[PDB]
Design a protein around this nucleic acid. Structure first.
Ligand SMILES: [Mg+2]
Ligand SMILES: [Zn+2]
Lengths: 330, 126, 237, 191, 63, 38, 158, 176
RNA sequence: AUCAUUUUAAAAAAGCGUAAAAGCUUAAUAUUAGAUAAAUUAAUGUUAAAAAUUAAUUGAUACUUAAAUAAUCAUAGAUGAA
């Protein structure tokens, strides 16, 4: 007698032809290479923040001799802060028996994991290292991009030499420094930093198979066809999901209060673009034999270098004139 | 002022919505209040709109059906497709993407048959 | 217009309300240009100190205030918020209206004289006012506002009234003083224009002219042209 | 202000009516905001309905709508079991309406009326069951309470009043004559 | 003023003698001089000055 | 393109785009309106 | 097809519609037959004097089809007849010299209403007030005159 | 507020799941072949219609990345049991092609060879001046379709050369 | 010169366009959906009413007046970061 929402009214919904029904006798991989899906959106969008992990950065060890050892993992602190304290420990500035007129130093340094280095910001790409080689012209600049990949070990050994006091005692000190790319040192009788290889599975947030079925609830379902892969969960269907945001009890309402909050969230996302990790992208191969994309055989040398006489069709073979089809099956 | 000489043509990218239709049937309950007016506006866009971008045999109607559960928008396309969309809960925007989900495919069906269902470039400039 | 013509013909009689209403406002204003409304206005404020400098206030969005006093009276200088000041303009009556300032239990009458704004930056520098006291002369600006009259015969046709002065400076000696002046120019003509002494003869007893400011009573305000056709016929011939 | 907390509830209401009932609200703002803020928290403790009568008649000049509802929402909870109480609400609710100019320009339709009948539906039993129990001082205030309220329903009390005057016609005062002659003249919406 | 257009003139009626009855059922508002014994000797001397003086000053207050 | 320090919009269709520290104007009608700031 | 390509205003004599080359500049490139066109015009306007110039509109279409529509003559020309002048003032408002009386306005408004499709909804005060503002732009006034004028045939460009 | 819309095709059927704790909310798509899930924060509220297979989103978090989240989500589902399509043309005198088993041979006034070779596409000729590509990913298609375009494109003076069948074309007068 | 009418609204037009015409867009505007309009101060004690309340602020949105702060860019010389 008045407007009551119906319950069981939905018509059939037209089913479209599948690519097998429409294009048999052709490459299956067409309808099986699915669309790309960038993961990095999701963790930002649907709110995954990695737990703050706080691993070790450096370490100081003594022996019954006078000799002390200073150990560093360059993947955990920045480069400069690692290099300041080296020059502060390599001398003995923490050792209260410090005379700068000493011909002898019982302080030794070790470094490890020099491949991966922390550089806060957009500095691994822009900053450079310059020098001159006696001859005219000269003035060779080089990028961190060269060191951080090919030989990153001059860099750590080059920045130390700039913080140390400019004198003759330097070489004796820098003779007592050692760097490694791997996660080890070869010395024996000393410890080694454990690497952090794990990566947080965020699976508990977007997967029922991780949780137990009795803790969960179904609030909505489309079909009368119920999956067998989902069995044991209740069905307490809300009357509330399908209601748009006007027909509900609580409405989010733009207002001087929430708009004031809106602007706080807006600065947050601008205030975070600054705290973003940039990476040296690697060089690239363009072998057509590897990619899933199409390509061109513009020239002849692209054949020999890649052995593409196969996928090229011979010239001694007929052609295809017109491939229209009138009737589309169902 | 000054005379344009670069002519930017935008006729081929023109993709209206009701173009692949053969007919339509509005359905109205006088007890709806949200599902009436949505169907009012569609019936205008079926006739108030331009006939170039429609078929030749396009006939839209309107009927008051008290017996229905909800007011509906039934439709029929060229190559066989047929559907109904009740309107007591939806919007005008949720409907259009359904129409694109058909109109985008009928091109993939008719182009394979050889039919040029596209427009000249000179129809609408910027 | 907003209703079809075919329905308006049925309701053409209704539009008397339109025209009968405009009788009421435009006549009311035309006779109420002269009178101050009887409504008290108040401005809470604070004293001056040597501490509160300008630029200190102007980040706090306050404003300085200045008052000039009269015979035997000392000057007074105060502090106030900007939005008070603009609201004081935003009345009709700003040219003359009496505004008070409550510091504490004290109240100081004033008038608007003017305001200065920093033109390149366009923020409020100060708000200047003039003291008013009852028993002593006080400068005010009485604007002139001329009514229309379809009762004279030359004014109706092809002639032009000329208002050479917008207002008059005077000295008032009593509480309630007139907002403005209103004139009915029927008896005027090309032969005689209005002169300030024709106003000086018709004022209350509490008012006088500030001769220090005006030039001479024989000065004239409202002038009337001759006819246009009598020129135009002569212009062509 | 040094001893606000030492007061009971109603001994603050007496300040409201003592100051705000006339042209200058003699007290300050802060001293009244204090009274205005305490009372609408402690409505759960004012014992009687007369104590609401004093309250509403003093707080009638409020500009905020939000707290009149708190009062009337309370009165809809506390039933009345006598007759002097109902008189003590009409005569007060009459003068102490919330005017429509203070209300917003956009609003539910005729929402001023819905504020009334929450009371009048809450009173209609008591004033109707025992209207024979009525006397000359409590007599006048009903004719006024209804005429000020613009209704046409309360005839039954009036019929019990028609029978009342004629009996006591001779023993009346000079005061109880005008209000009758002025009351019955415009009984049911100036009929 | 707006006031002249929404004012029930109080002349033509001994208002306060009439108006105080209709509230008199409200006990807490009933003023009581003798409730304030320390100043009652003072406050009442003032009211003599009111009525006894020329004109009708207190009688013109609300009126 | 032409390097205008003080950029300027000629037609309504002109619009601004920022690629990092880079700034420029482009037009969908007149490709001569486009600029750069340097 | 039924879509409207273009609209043109014209001016024609009633029964002397004829393929003048000074109208093919407009209707030439649209492929319309001036001869077949003017036939249907003169056929309708046989109940009208031939000296009079009317105006017409033509919704020229995409297939070079047409649908002609007839309107009353130019409102200015009708007044020059009554006024017995051919050319009017350079200026307006300042130079006011001409005079008609109302008793013909009430008669020439009926011309517009009896024919023009736009005024079918309209009353006569409405139409009469339309020309008075057109008269203000021309040097014309509305003043009572007992006399009648004598005939005049002011020009038209045709 | 912008209330973004998530389309779902008709072949797909879905469910929506929550805890008793109501602190977690996620959604499950399931087809004959595939299955796919994704969650929603506590700050994203949701509305569903079976009438349209559309879902509506509000975001109290005010993240602007969601507008990209849509296009991935929408196209990733229509990428199941449906193609994307595109069409290419040309107009000219000394132009042609030849087609042999997803290996298109182009001859457009160039000294060098111009073979086009499709890895995991479909290519079917409808006329001499027309060819359609078909593939399930839209992003590989354009990289596959545009390589054909770069050989010759539309002259701004004459519409002679290749072009897509839906595009903004430029023209400029010449030799009046 | 700036009138007037039909319209729910539409400038003898603020502009592009034409050999002159035609044609295109803004101002003004409608249908539908979504959707901002929230907080307060001062007055005549109580009697007019099928009815009507003044002066005034702050704030959300759009138009409008505009200024200020912060960062970025605004070409560089001659043995080699300089
Ligand atoms: Mg016009
Ligand atoms: Zn441009």
């Amino acid at each position: 007698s008045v407007w009551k929402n119906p319950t069981n009214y939905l018509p059939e919904k037209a089913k479209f032809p599948s690519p097998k029904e429409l294009f048999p006798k052709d490459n299956e991989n067409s309808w099986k290479t699915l669309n790309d899906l960038t993961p990095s959106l999701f963790k930002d969008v649907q709110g995954f923040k990695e737990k703050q992990v706080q691993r070790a950065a450096y370490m100081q060890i003594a022996k019954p001799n006078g000799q002390m050892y200073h150990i560093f993992d360059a993947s955990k602190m920045p480069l400069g802060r690692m290099c300041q304290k080296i020059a502060f420990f390599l001398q003995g500035k923490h050792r209260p028996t410090f005379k700068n007129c000493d011909q002898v130093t019982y302080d030794n340094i070790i470094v490890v994991n020099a491949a991966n280095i922390m550089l806060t910001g957009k500095k691994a790409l822009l900053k450079t290292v310059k020098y001159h080689t006696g001859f005219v012209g000269g003035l060779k600049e080089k990028s961190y991009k060269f060191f951080l990949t090919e030989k990153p070990e001059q860099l750590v050994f080059y920045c130390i030499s700039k913080m140390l006091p400019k004198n003759l005692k330097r070489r004796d000190l820098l003779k007592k420094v050692e760097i490694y790319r791997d996660f080890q040192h070869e010395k024996q009788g000393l410890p080694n930093f454990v690497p952090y290889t794990e990566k947080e599975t965020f699976d508990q947030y977007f997967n029922p198979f991780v949780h137990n079925f009795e803790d969960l609830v179904i609030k909505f379902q489309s079909s009368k066809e119920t999956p067998k892969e989902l069995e044991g969960i209740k069905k307490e269907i809300d009357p509330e999901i399908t209601l748009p945001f006007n027909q509900r009890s609580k409405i989010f309402k733009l207002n001087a209060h929430n708009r004031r909050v809106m602007k706080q969230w807006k600065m947050y996302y601008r205030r975070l673009r600054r705290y973003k990790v940039h990476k040296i992208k690697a060089p690239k191969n363009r072998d057509p034999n590897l990619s899933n994309k199409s390509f061109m055989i513009t020239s002849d040398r692209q054949i020999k270098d890649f052995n593409l006489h196969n996928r090229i069709v011979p010239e001694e073979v007929p052609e295809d004139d017109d491939e229209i089809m009138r009737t589309i099956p169902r | 002022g000054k005379k344009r000489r670069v002519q930017v043509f935008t006729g081929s990218m023109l993709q209206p919505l009701y173009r692949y239709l053969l007919s339509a049937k509005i359905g109205v309950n006088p007890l709806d209040l949200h599902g009436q007016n949505i169907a009012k506006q569609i019936f205008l866009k079926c006739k108030q709109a331009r006939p170039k971008y429609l078929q030749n045999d396009f006939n839209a109607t309107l009927v008051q059906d008290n017996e229905a559960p909800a007011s509906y928008f039934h439709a029929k396309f060229v190559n066989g497709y047929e559907q109904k969309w009740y309107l007591h809960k939806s919007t005008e925007e949720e409907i259009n993407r359904n129409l694109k989900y058909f109109n985008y495919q009928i091109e993939m069906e008719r182009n394979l048959q050889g039919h040029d269902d596209e427009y000249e470039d000179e129809e609408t400039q910027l | 217009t907003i209703v079809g013509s075919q329905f308006d013909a049925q309701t053409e009689h209704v539009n008397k309300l339109a025209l009968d209403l405009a009788n009421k406002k435009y006549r009311k204003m035309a006779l109420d240009q002269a009178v101050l409304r009887k409504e008290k206005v108040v401005v809470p404020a604070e004293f001056r100190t040597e501490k509160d400098s300008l630029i200190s206030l102007k980040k706090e969005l306050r404003s300085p205030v200045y008052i000039k006093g009269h015979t035997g009276i000392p000057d007074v200088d105060l502090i106030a918020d900007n939005r008070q000041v603009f609201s004081i303009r935003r009345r009709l009556q700003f040219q003359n209206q009496s505004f008070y300032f409550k510091v504490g239990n004290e109240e100081f009458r004033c008038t608007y004289d003017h305001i200065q704004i920093h033109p390149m930056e366009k923020w409020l520098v100060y708000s200047k006012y003039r003291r008013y006291v009852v028993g002593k002369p006080n400068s005010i600006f009485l604007p002139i506002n001329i009514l229309p009259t379809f009762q004279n015969n030359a004014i109706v046709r092809g002639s032009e009234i000329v208002q050479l002065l917008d207002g008059i400076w005077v000295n008032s000696y009593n509480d309630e003083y007139p907002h403005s002046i209103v004139i009915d120019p029927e008896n005027l003509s090309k032969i005689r224009p209005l002169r300030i002494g024709d106003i000086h003869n018709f004022l209350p007893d509490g008012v006088e002219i500030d001769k220090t400011k005006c030039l001479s009573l024989h000065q004239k305000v409202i002038k009337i042209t001759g006819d246009k056709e009598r020129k135009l016929d002569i212009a062509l011939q | 202000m040094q001893s606000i907390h030492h007061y009971p509830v109603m001994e603050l209401v007496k300040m409201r009516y003592a100051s705000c009932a006339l042209s200058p609200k003699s007290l300050s703002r802060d001293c009244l905001k204090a009274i205005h803020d305490i009372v609408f928290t402690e409505l759960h403790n004012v014992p009687s309905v007369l104590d609401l009568s004093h309250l509403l008649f003093a707080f009638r000049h409020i500009n905020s709508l939000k707290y009149y509802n708190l009062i009337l929402d309370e009165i809809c909870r506390r039933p009345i079991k006598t007759l002097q109480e109902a008189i003590a609400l009409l005569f007060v609710f009459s003068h102490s309406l919330f005017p429509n100019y203070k209300r917003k320009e956009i609003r539910e339709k005729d929402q001023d009326l819905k504020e009334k009948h929450k009371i009048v539906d809450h009173l209609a039993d008591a004033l109707a069951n025992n209207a024979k129990q009525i006397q000359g001082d409590d007599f006048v205030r009903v004719l006024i309470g209804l005429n000020n309220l613009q209704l046409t329903t309360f005839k039954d009390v009036l019929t019990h009043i028609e029978r009342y005057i004629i009996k006591n016609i001779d023993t009346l005062d000079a005061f109880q004559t005008s209000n009758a002659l002025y009351g019955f003249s415009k009984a049911n919406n100036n009929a | 003023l707006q006031k002249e257009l929404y004012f029930h003139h109080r002349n033509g009626k001994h208002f306060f003698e009439q108006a105080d009855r209709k509230i008199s059922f409200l006990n807490q508002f009933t003023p009581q001089i003798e409730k304030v014994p320390e100043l009652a000797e003072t406050l009442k001397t003032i009211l003599k000055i009111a009525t006894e003086s020329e004109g009708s000053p207190l009688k013109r207050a609300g009126i | 393109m032409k390097i205008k320090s003080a950029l300027k919009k000629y037609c309504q269709h002109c619009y601004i785009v920022k690629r990092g520290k880079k700034v420029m104007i482009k037009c969908k009608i007149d490709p001569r309106h486009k600029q750069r700031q340097g | 097809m039924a879509e409207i390509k273009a609209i043109i205003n014209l001016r024609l004599l009633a029964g002397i519609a004829k393929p003048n080359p000074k109208m093919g500049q407009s209707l030439g490139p649209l492929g319309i037959n001036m001869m077949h066109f003017c036939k249907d015009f003169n056929a309708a306007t046989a109940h009208i004097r031939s000296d009079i110039p009317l105006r017409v509109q033509v919704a020229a279409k995409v297939d070079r089809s047409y649908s002609y529509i007839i309107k009353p003559p130019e409102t200015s020309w009708l007044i020059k007849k009554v006024i017995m002048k051919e050319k009017l003032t350079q200026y307006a408002g300042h130079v006011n010299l001409d005079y008609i009386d109302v008793r013909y306005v009430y008669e020439i408004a009926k011309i517009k209403k009896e024919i023009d499709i736009d005024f079918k909804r309209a009353t006569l005060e409405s139409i009469c007030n339309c020309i008075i503002g057109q008269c203000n732009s021309m040097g014309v006034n509305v003043s009572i005159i007992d006399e009648k004028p004598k005939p005049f045939n002011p020009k038209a460009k045709v | 507020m912008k209330r973004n819309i998530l389309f779902i095709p008709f072949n797909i059927s879905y469910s929506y799941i929550e805890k008793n704790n109501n602190t977690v909310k996620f959604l499950y798509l399931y087809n004959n072949d595939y299955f796919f899930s994704i969650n929603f924060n506590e700050k994203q509220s949701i509305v569903i219609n079976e009438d349209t297979n559309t879902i509506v989103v509000e975001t109290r978090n005010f993240n602007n990345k969601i507008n990209l989240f849509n296009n991935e989500f929408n196209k990733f589902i229509y990428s199941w049991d449906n193609f994307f399509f595109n069409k290419i043309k040309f107009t000219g005198k000394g132009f042609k092609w030849k087609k042999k088993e997803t290996n298109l041979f182009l001859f457009f006034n160039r000294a060098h060879k111009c073979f086009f070779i499709g890895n995991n596409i479909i290519l079917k000729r409808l006329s001499k001046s027309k060819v359609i590509l078909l593939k399930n990913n839209y992003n590989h298609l354009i990289h596959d379709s545009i390589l054909v375009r770069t050989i010759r494109s539309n002259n701004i003076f004459t519409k002679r050369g290749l072009r897509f069948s839906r595009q903004i074309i430029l023209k400029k007068k010449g030799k009046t």
